[PDB]
């Protein structure tokens, strides 16, 4: 029963932990887009 325990446990946990890396990697990549696109028009801002 013990083992049973532990095994429902560490299944539920390593899914809820590769789901929330996923997450914070596309939101890493989101953040490099959004800073990759802004560094643009910084001449053109400052200029104007």
């Known amino acids: ?23 914070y990697h596309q939101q890493f990549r989101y953040k490099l887009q959004d800073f990759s696109d802004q560094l643009s028009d910084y001449y053109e801002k400052f200029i104007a």
Request: glycine letters at 0%; zero cysteines.
């Open 1 to 23: 029963e013990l083992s049973a325990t532990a095994q429902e446990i560490i299944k539920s946990q390593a899914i809820a932990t590769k789901k929330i890396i996923s997450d």
